[PDB]
Symmetry: none
Subunit: 122 residues, 2 copies
């Protein structure tokens, strides 16, 4: 478990929180929830004008796979990136970091295509 023994981050509460106050969700929270609740396997995926091989950008891969399993809208999926979205990207539009976030902002779920699945529930 991410936080300690006998301590697992509950999926439902996370999703409820994300739905209520997406702006308060941190990247480390999303990661704890994904790590605790899923088994990850790498997967290639395209994301508008960017393409990721398996094992490239595994963090983004996890978040989009999570967004698909949990039927998250574009705004909620972006919010799962926490400060990477809210600070790194939104405050600095001309930077070139987090290409997956920047691409998904443009083309959204329409632009996403996985070659295979990356997450299975525990």
């Amino acid at each position: 478990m991410a936080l300690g023994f006998g301590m697992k981050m509950e999926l439902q509460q996370f999703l409820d929180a994300l739905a209520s106050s997406p702006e308060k969700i941190e990247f480390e929270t999303t990661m704890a929830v994904i790590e605790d609740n899923y088994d990850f396997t790498p997967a290639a995926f395209t994301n508008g004008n960017t393409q990721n091989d398996a094992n490239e950008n595994n963090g983004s891969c996890k978040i989009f796979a999570f967004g698909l399993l949990n039927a998250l809208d574009k705004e909620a999926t972006l919010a799962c990136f926490g400060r990477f979205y809210r600070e790194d990207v939104l405050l600095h539009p001309e930077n070139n970091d987090h290409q997956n976030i920047r691409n998904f902002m443009v083309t959204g779920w329409e632009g996403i295509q996985f070659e295979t699945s990356a997450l299975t529930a525990k």
Copy 2:
């Protein structure tokens, strides 16, 4: 039907966007069959829980909606007559529980344990 005949995904989505009431369940099932490998998956849908291999029609349609960025109403349209006739015209009946649940709670009520469709 014939050898070498496959339903193209893009045209189905364009047709669904243009004239959703002309979409029929058979067409949706064919497009999913032609375009995806299906793996039974457990999922919850508001107040209903579906085991893997239970309610495979609903499992496929919801997975297909997510993969193709469909909103609630476009997804319901993929059920064709089962939504438009059986459910909408008969609020007192309790068939098609996945359609009935999704109408109320939408994508916020949907959670898949595993991915049901992978692109061919």
